[PDB]
Amino acid sequence: EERKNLHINELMNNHEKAFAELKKYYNDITAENLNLIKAHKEKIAQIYANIQ
Amino acid sequence: DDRVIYRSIRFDNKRAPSSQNNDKVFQDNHVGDVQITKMTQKFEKNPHYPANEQIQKMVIDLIKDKVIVYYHMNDGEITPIVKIYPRDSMHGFAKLNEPGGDNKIDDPLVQLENTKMVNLEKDCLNQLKQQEKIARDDEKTIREGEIRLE
Amino acid sequence: DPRVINEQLILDAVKQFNQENNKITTENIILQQLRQLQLSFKNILKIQHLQGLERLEKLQLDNNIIEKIENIDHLVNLKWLDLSFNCIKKIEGLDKLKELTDLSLFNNYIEKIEGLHNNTKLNVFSIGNNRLKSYEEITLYFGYKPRGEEGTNDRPEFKRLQVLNVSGNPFTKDKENEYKNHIICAIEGDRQLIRQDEQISNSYNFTTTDYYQQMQAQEQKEEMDRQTLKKKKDARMDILDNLKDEYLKIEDLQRVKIIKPNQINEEIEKYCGKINDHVVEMQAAVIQKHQLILQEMSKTEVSYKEQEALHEKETLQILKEFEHEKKVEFRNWEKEAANGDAKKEESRLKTLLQKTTSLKNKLMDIEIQLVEELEAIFTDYDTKKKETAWKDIEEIIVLGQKKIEEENVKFYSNLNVIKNKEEANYNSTQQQQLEEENNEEDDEKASLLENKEQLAQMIGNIKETLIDSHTKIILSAQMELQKDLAEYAKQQKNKMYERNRKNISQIIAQIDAYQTEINEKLKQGDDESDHEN
Amino acid sequence: EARAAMIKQLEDNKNQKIAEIIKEHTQKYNDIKNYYSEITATNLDYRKTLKNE
């Protein structure tokens, strides 16, 4: 019983580590765009106004 | 250990070795192929188990398609435990084709006791056969070994 | 919210447990019928709602965030307890979970084997991948202590602790097999394989075989002590254990000691010795006579058993003849139904019904004879024991009281002699010395020597309290033993009545069974002639 | 024989629970991966507006 619980917990720790790694990885690669795009559209409006 | 300190089997020499009922056809060293009618295993009243819960005696009357099990009596008991169980279903022969029939087979206990009595019947028959072979071999050796002296 | 047991959560857990084990979830699965509990991987943090689950013997709550042992201690039934691989950090609540057999607190934050001194029943212990630093905590449970430490645990605690794992702990990872060797020599073939270690074996001297013999001898001695104490209490004689201590409760003797503390203290010591002696002889004699009581009770109970078994077999065989009689009756009845003599079938079945009535009368009378046999057994045993054993207890307890009061008397006389010597000495000193530093002890001595009646009353009240308490304790012991013997008599009477009632009711049941079988056969015979129209 | 059977069934239960844990981890990994792949794909494709803008 002792040894099986040891393995079970080692396994869950590995699983949690992998999940946390994936979590930061995808958050980091998710965290980019909307604001840059807002700025692009802001300067789009600025430009076109300058041309008018 | 199993507490069956007595085991019996009635035969019907009138009954030829009916091929239909093999369990009723027994390996008899003396008559050969005859139709069994009765088996019985008497389970010692274990002090570790209740008298009324241990099968005091089990009586596999193959023909009756049922068994009679007695459970040991207790102090002050004068009402014997004569329980009679239809063997037609104890071997799991309970046909589910019957629509609407209450399926206590669904609850484990029904088929649990069915298989308990199935095991009792198989153990009794096979112990009878094995002891028949034991006696056969012992007597064969005895009557095949020549007379010799120390 | 950390998982804390509630009624609905318990219901869900029971549902799941039955689903897994294929167990029929009896709708009224009692909230308090729990012996095995398993709540792993729920990430429980605290223990609650276990009232009614005190019958929990196998507990499984490991692999979670739990950190404290609580609300399981009242679940003393817990033998196979695992609370391991958690945030748990201490061992507790198992003191009353002494019944603990397989204790596990692995992969937790425990750093000592604590509360298990009351788990000395624990043969099996795991404290691995905890935060321990040494194995000696477990060996302390075996009469083993490190050199240079003064301890009162000269007797092993985990005497039956042979399952011992500490693997994964800080120290257990430290210079491996050290704790194995020392724990084993101080405490599974690994145990002997590790005793094979030469040097750590030298690190201990109290070998495991010596441990076996110590355990065996201690068990034997404790059995002897239990038997002797039970003998004395069955004599109802231990109440006199404070007999010589009555001077302790008597304050006047303390004042009397003032006159001559040395002589009076020695006389009181002799008084205690004599009181305790006479108490020992008289209590032991009562022990032996109530041992006679126990043996005669055993013989009377064996007579009960033998008479009851005789009547058992009597009724059994009688019903056996009835059984085979009705076997032939019904075989013939069947073969006749193949023939159709329903009239004579009914005639013989009504004859068998009258036979059942006669058998009811005969077997009721048989049980009546057994009851009379056992009642005469009780009467004869009561006559012999009460008159011989109970009386003898009476006389020897009275003799103990007699010698006790006699010892009180001569102790009182010696106290008075000491008083007289002190008064004479003080009177002689008074006419030749009228000033000495006003000592307080001598002031009280002179106060008594002036109030002769004061010291006389003090010693008289000493004797009064001694005799009163001794007589009260002796009469209390006699009444306690009277109640014990009358209680045993009532127990035997109740046993007789219970067997009588069970036999009566079950004879009624079997008579009804025979009568119903005969009624069934009679109805068969009647309706067999009813379809012939 | 009883000890071997008890150890066998103990291991059966323990390893079955271990397999359940592993399967749960794998499926949850797949689910997280798929959902945040959806999110990241939306984020990346939502820049061709910029590049055409």
Gap from D21 CA to chain A (nearest CA, Å) = 7
Interface touch A1/D10, C-beta < 8 Å:
yes
Q: Is C494 on the interface with B (CB under 8 A)?
A: no
Enter the tokens of residue C511.
């008579």
Which residue from C59, C89, C87, C88 is spatially nearest to C73, judged by alpha carbons? Answer: C59
Question: Which residues sit opposite C126 in a β-bridge?
Answer: C104, C165
Q: Rounded to whole angstroms, how far apart are CA atoms C456 and B137?
A: 102
DSSP type of residue C84: -
A22 contact residues in D (CB cutoff 8 A): 29, 32-33
State how beta strands C80-82 and C58-60 pair: parallel
Residue with the two structure tokens 């619980």: A5
State how beta strands C36-38 and B81-86 pair: unpaired
Resolution (angstroms) equals 3.6
CA distances from B111 to B41, B114, B116 (A): 20, 5, 8
Interface touch C510/B107, C-beta < 8 Å:
no
CA B22 from chain centre, in angstroms, equals: 14
CA B96 from chain centre, in angstroms, equals: 26
Q: How many CB atoms lie within 10 A of CB C118?
A: 17
Q: Rounded to whole angstroms, how far apart are CA atoms C265 and C65?
A: 64
- φ, ψ of residue C121 in degrees (nearest 5): -60, -20
Q: Is D53 on the interface with A (CB under 8 A)?
A: yes
- Closest partner residue to B76 (CB to CB) among C24, C316, C503 is C503
Judged by 3 or more CB pairs under 8 A, whether B touches C is yes
Angle in degrees, 0-180, between the axes of helices C342-384 and C452-528, rounded to the nearest 10: 170
Helix then strand then coil, % of chain B, to nearest 5: 25, 30, 45
- Give SS3 for C341: coil
Q: Rounded to whole angstroms, how far apart are CA atoms C308 and C315?
A: 10
Burial bucket for residue B94 (CB in 10 Å: 0-12, 13-18, 19+): middle
DSSP type of residue C175: S
Its sign, for the CA torsion B130, B131, B132, B137, is: positive
- φ, ψ of residue B148 in degrees (nearest 5): -145, 160
Question: Which residues sit opposite B38 in a β-bridge?
Answer: B10
Residue with the two structure tokens 């239909």: B20
**C97 within 8 A of C72, measured Cβ to Cβ:** yes
Q: Rounded to whole angstroms, how far apart are CA atoms B105 and C479?
A: 62
Angle in degrees, 0-180, between the axes of helices C261-337 and C208-234, rounded to the nearest 10: 90
- Closest partner residue to D25 (CB to CB) among A15, A33, A37 is A15
**C141 within 8 A of C156, measured Cβ to Cβ:** yes
- Give SS3 for C109: coil
Q: Rounded to whole angstroms, how far apart are CA atoms C237 and C399?
A: 13
Interface touch D15/A4, C-beta < 8 Å:
yes
Which residues make Cβ contacts (< 8 Å) with residue B33, sequence separation at least 6? Answer: B16, B17, B25
Q: Rounded to whole angstroms, how far apart are CA atoms C288 and C396?
A: 11
Enter the tokens of residue C221.
């001695």
Burial bucket for residue C203 (CB in 10 Å: 0-12, 13-18, 19+): middle
Which residues make Cβ contacts (< 8 Å) with residue C48, sequence separation at least 6? Answer: C4, C5, C71
The H or E element spanning position C155 is none
Q: Rounded to whole angstroms, how far apart are CA atoms B52 and C506?
A: 13
Q: Rounded to whole angstroms, how far apart are CA atoms B35 and B15?
A: 5
Interface touch A8/D47, C-beta < 8 Å:
no
Q: Rounded to whole angstroms, how far apart are CA atoms B150 and C7?
A: 81
Q: Rounded to whole angstroms, how far apart are CA atoms C96 and C120?
A: 11
**B42 within 8 A of B56, measured Cβ to Cβ:** yes
- Encoded amino acid at C120, one letter: T
- φ, ψ of residue B114 in degrees (nearest 5): -55, -50
Burial bucket for residue C311 (CB in 10 Å: 0-12, 13-18, 19+): buried
Enter the tokens of residue C284.
């032991």
Which residue from C399, C398, C418 is spatially nearest to C410, judged by alpha carbons? Answer: C418
- Encoded amino acid at A31, one letter: A
Instruction: Give one DSSP letter per residue of A1-52, joined into a string.
Output: -HHHHHHHHHHHHHHHHHHHHHHHHHHHHHS-SHHHHHHHHHHHHHHHHHH-
Enter the tokens of residue C79.
């033998």
Locate the chain C residue with the closest alpha carbon to B109: C24
- φ, ψ of residue C341 in degrees (nearest 5): -95, 60
A1 contact residues in C (CB cutoff 8 A): 82, 102, 104
CB pairs under 8 A between A and D: 59
Burial bucket for residue C304 (CB in 10 Å: 0-12, 13-18, 19+): buried
CA distances from C199 to C162, C178, C467, C472 (A): 21, 10, 65, 63
Which residue from C312, C327, C363 is spatially nearest to B73, judged by alpha carbons? Answer: C312
CA C478 from chain centre, in angstroms, equals: 23
Helix then strand then coil, % of chain D, to nearest 5: 90, 0, 10
End-to-end CA distance of chain C: 81
DSSP type of residue B106: T
DSSP type of residue C389: I
DSSP type of residue C42: S
Residue with the two structure tokens 């001559």: C260
Q: Rounded to whole angstroms, how far apart are CA atoms C461 and C455?
A: 10
DSSP type of residue C88: -
State how beta strands B55-61 and B66-71 pair: antiparallel
- φ, ψ of residue C47 in degrees (nearest 5): -115, 130
Give chain B's length.
150
**C515 within 8 A of C356, measured Cβ to Cβ:** yes
- φ, ψ of residue B38 in degrees (nearest 5): -145, 145
Q: Rounded to whole angstroms, how far apart are CA atoms C186 and C161?
A: 11
The H or E element spanning position C248 is helix C246-249
Enter the tokens of residue C344.
């004579």
Gap from C63 CA to chain A (nearest CA, Å) = 7
A24 contact residues in D (CB cutoff 8 A): none
Q: Rounded to whole angstroms, how far apart are CA atoms C274 and C403?
A: 9
Its sign, for the CA torsion B18, B24, B25, B29, is: negative
**C58 within 8 A of C34, measured Cβ to Cβ:** no
D23 contact residues in A (CB cutoff 8 A): none
End-to-end CA distance of chain A: 79
Which residue from C339, C242, C342 is spatially nearest to C283, judged by alpha carbons? Answer: C242
Q: How many CB atoms lie within 10 A of CB B81?
A: 18
- φ, ψ of residue B146 in degrees (nearest 5): -70, 165
Instruction: Give one DSSP letter per residue of C232-246, joined into a string.
Output: HHHTT-GGGGGSTTH
Mutation pick from C85, C109, C130, C163 vs chain A, by most beta carbons of A within 10 Å, is C85
Give chain C's length.
533
CA atoms within 13 A on the CB side of B87: 21
Judged by 3 or more CB pairs under 8 A, whether D touches A is yes
- φ, ψ of residue C170 in degrees (nearest 5): -55, -50
Q: Rounded to whole angstroms, how far apart are CA atoms C53 and C73?
A: 11
Q: Rounded to whole angstroms, how far apart are CA atoms B111 and B119?
A: 12
Strands (E) in B65-124, as ranges, are 66-71, 81-86
CA distances from B80 to B56, C52, C305, D8 (A): 10, 37, 20, 42
Query: What method did the depositors use to determine the structure?
Result: cryo-EM
- Encoded amino acid at C233, one letter: K
- Closest partner residue to A1 (CB to CB) among C104, C107, C129 is C104
**C108 within 8 A of C130, measured Cβ to Cβ:** yes
